[PDB]
Structures are given as C-alpha cells and as structure tokens.
Amino acid sequence: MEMEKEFEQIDKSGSWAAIYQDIRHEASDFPSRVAKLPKNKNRNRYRDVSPFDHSRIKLHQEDNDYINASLIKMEEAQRSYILTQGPLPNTVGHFWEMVWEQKSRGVVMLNRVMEKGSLKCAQYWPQKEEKEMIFEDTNLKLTLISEDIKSYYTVRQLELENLTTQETREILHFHYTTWPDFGVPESPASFLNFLFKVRESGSLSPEHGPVVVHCSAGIGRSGTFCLADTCLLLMDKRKDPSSVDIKKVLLEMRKFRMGLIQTADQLRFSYLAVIEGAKFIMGD
Ligand SMILES: COCCNC1CCN(C(C)=O)CC1
Ligand SMILES: COCCNC1CCN(C(C)=O)CC1
C-alpha cells in the first residue's frame, strides 16, 4: 500500500502495536559474540543492545578492537551510517578514535546528557574554547571552535587532532536538544528541519566517511533519523515514489543493527516524518 493512506488506515483501526510486533518477529537474528566477551562488559551500556559481529565497527588496535557501534550500509539509497550508543566514561577515547579512523565529518546526537534525572551519556566534548580535552588512552586532542545555539538544536565546530601525527580535522557536532523525556514529538517539523541541516553540511555525503549517530542506546531515536533520511532519498531516486515501503526499509536496516525503532510510537512518528517531508521536498 501507499504510505499516507496505510497511515490513516492504521490510525483508524488502532493497530500500531500489531504492526510493530510483526516487525519485531520478522527481524534478523545474527551473532554478537564479541560484544558478550567478559573483557567487554564495561564497554556496553545495556546488556540487551549489542552490535552484530558481521557489521560491527573495529577499532584499529591490537589489544582490544571492540566498540558498541554498527555500520548500516544502504545499497540502493547509496548512504551509510554508523549507529552507536552514547559514550560511557571508559569509552570516550574509543568513540573519538572511531570518528578519526572512519574519516567521519559529522556526529549527530539525539539525547541530552541528563534525561529523567539520570545520566544518558558522558560529557564527551568540551564546553569552553579555552578548556580542551585530551584522551590519553587513544592519543587525541579535542577543541571547541564555535557553538551556535538555536531553539531546537545546537551546532558545534570541533577540532580533532591526532597527537601521534599532528594531523588535524574539522568535525561538525549536530545536537538535537528538544526530544521529550517521554514519548515522541507532537509534530515532525523540527526533526525534519534538523535532518536537512545535517544534509546541507556535507556530513551525509560520499566524499566523507559515514556520519556517526547516537542517542542513549543507539537504536531508538537513532533508528528514526536514518530510517527517515533513507526513505526520503529513495522517494527522490525512484520513478514511482509510492513504491517506497517504510516497513521493508526498516527490516533491511535491522540486518545491520538489532532493535532499530524501540516502540510503536516511534514507528508512527517515523511514518509521520516521511509523509510530511515528502511534501516539502517538492510542493504540497
Ligand atoms: C583533567 O581531566 C581531563 C579529562 N579529559 C576527558 C574528559 C571527559 N572524560 C570522561 C570520562 O568523562 C574523559 C577524559
Ligand atoms: C499514490 O500516490 C502516492 C504518491 N507517492 C509520492 C509520490 C511523489 N513523491 C515524491 C517524493 O516525489 C512522494 C511519494
């Protein structure tokens, strides 16, 4: 079925939970043996969210190459994403090592450091120009260059220096700051505006390594971001845009990381975002 009318049909019939449970039942199951080794326990935020072995990002280190991060490679859309958990106190150096080694231009953050009164990720970037951060375990230096605070999101320019080689690179930090502590946003307008700002920066384009996107577990809000981006790109590429099937795209993405889209409300919100976005791209 088309999307917008499939959408109203699920709303009128109140069957979002059943649609979402079907997706959960059909999703891929691949091994995640490296994530479950005892030496990696303090590298995982949640015991039930792990990268598959076949798609995990490897650190360029011979001691321990493990990070909780996955490469999502979308062949028809010609887009790749790295989805990862929010960094832990003992993985902030690994996180920036990954950004460096994978040649990423941008980092997309969809959570606040504290939500619901609890810490959802480490404070992993500097908050003042004159107070830079050094990660001694991976030999990297990180400096805040500029910060632009807007009503729904903040964009930061950061300098990452490999202290071994003295090479430097400019990294863009796109921070969506207004996702509610509970539930999903009422309108997708600010989330779509944010997606378009990431696109306009070059951070999603083939002349760079894959964008790094995270929330707390790296599967819920993060899954919504890449699902909406890929569906909109496919609607632009194909002769028949109504052929794009958001459930089929989501199951394809779940071949590369488990659990993408965590609730039926997140699934409905993803539909809403793609539907509204497809009108702005053109003219209705
Ligand atoms: C004087 O301490 C400088 C610490 N630089 C960074 C600060 C952020 N870090 C954590 C674990 O939160 C990792 C080390
Ligand atoms: C039955 O018609 C459904 C049309 N789907 C539309 C077709 C045009 N689209 C775009 C993005 O050009 C969005 C999807």
| CATH code for the domain of 75 | 3.90.190.10
What's the chain's Rg over C-alpha atoms? 19
Q: Which residues have a C–N gap over 2.5 Å right after them in the chain?
A: 282
C-alpha distances (whole Å) from 81 to each of 46, 100, 116, 126 are 21, 15, 28, 24
Domain around 170: 1-284
Hey, is 190 helix, strand or coil? helix
The number of beta carbons lying within 10 Å of the beta carbon of residue 33 is 9
Instruction: Supply 126's token pair.
Output: 């500097």
DSSP class of residue 120 equals -
> Would you please indicate which residues are annotated as catalytic (active-site) residues?
215
* Nearest ligand 1 atom to alpha carbon 90: 11
Of 230, 233, 235, the residue with max ligand 2 atoms within 8 A of its CB, to mutate for a pocket test, comes to: 235
Q: Identify the nearest ligand to the CA of 122 by its number.
A: 1
Per the listing, tokens 């975002």 go with 273
Q: Binding site residues for substrate, as ranges?
A: 181, 215-221, 262
Number of domains forming the structure of the chain: 1
Ramachandran bin of 139, using left for φ above 0, alpha for ψ from -120 to 50, beta for the remaining angles: left
* 193 token code pair: 């505006």
DSSP three-state, residue 107: strand
Q: How far is CA 180 from CA 87, 97, 218, in A?
A: 20, 30, 16
Q: Containing H/E element for 41?
A: none
Q: Are 53 and 225 in contact (CB under 8 A)?
A: no
* 3-state DSSP helix/strand/coil % of the chain, to nearest 5: 35, 25, 45
Ramachandran bin of 38, using left for φ above 0, alpha for ψ from -120 to 50, beta for the remaining angles: alpha
